[PDB]
Amino acid sequence: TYQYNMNFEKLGKCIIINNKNFDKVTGMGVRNGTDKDAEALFKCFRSLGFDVIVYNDCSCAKMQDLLKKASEEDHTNAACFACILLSHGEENVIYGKDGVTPIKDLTAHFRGDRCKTLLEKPKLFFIQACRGTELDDGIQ
Amino acid sequence: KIPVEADFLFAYSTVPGYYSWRSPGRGSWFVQALCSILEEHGKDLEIMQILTRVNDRVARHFESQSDDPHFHEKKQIPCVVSMLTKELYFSQ
């Protein structure tokens, strides 16, 4: 009909990448408060029924591999997939502890032609990160 | 035959070209909001309804506080990008 079929034995896998500390060469500061976020997110997504695992201070290579490996698992009995990224960032890119990587590359691993078992199933990504340096001064 | 780019949903904490706020003592705005709504309606509302209430909460309940006049009283609005082809519910 009009709703995604959720009749699977597993809701799905959930990856949370929690980046707090970065290599001094990147010049990025400690993202204090990101631990509360990750713990809170953990409980929520767990309650939904996701099998969540948290990875801390990942390197760009780690993040890439993490998602590549996930896209290679067998999702035949999962209803969907979810990934949460908490970090520093810029337009179209996200920071690892060692530098920046294209969000595009992290996600294209799940394209329908690159992950048959998640075909026709929802791929979810929640990204908490800057996307530039513009300020929204607001209005009343 | 379906589009290889179909069925993706990106829920960004902010719009393109903008900053994203995070209070060091309570956590980032986007996540505090996302969790409030989810622990309250994660199982009875469609994903887009949930993310929409999140946009509203972020845009209304938050405002930057800083001893730096340039970063004082700033606002934020999340950004949802959906290529989904059906309605999504986390239940049944």
């Binding site: 500061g29 | 994203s20 060091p24 970063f71």
Partner: peptide, 4 residues
């Protein structure tokens, strides 16, 4: 508040 800080920025990300």
């Amino acid at each position: 508040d800080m920025q990300x």
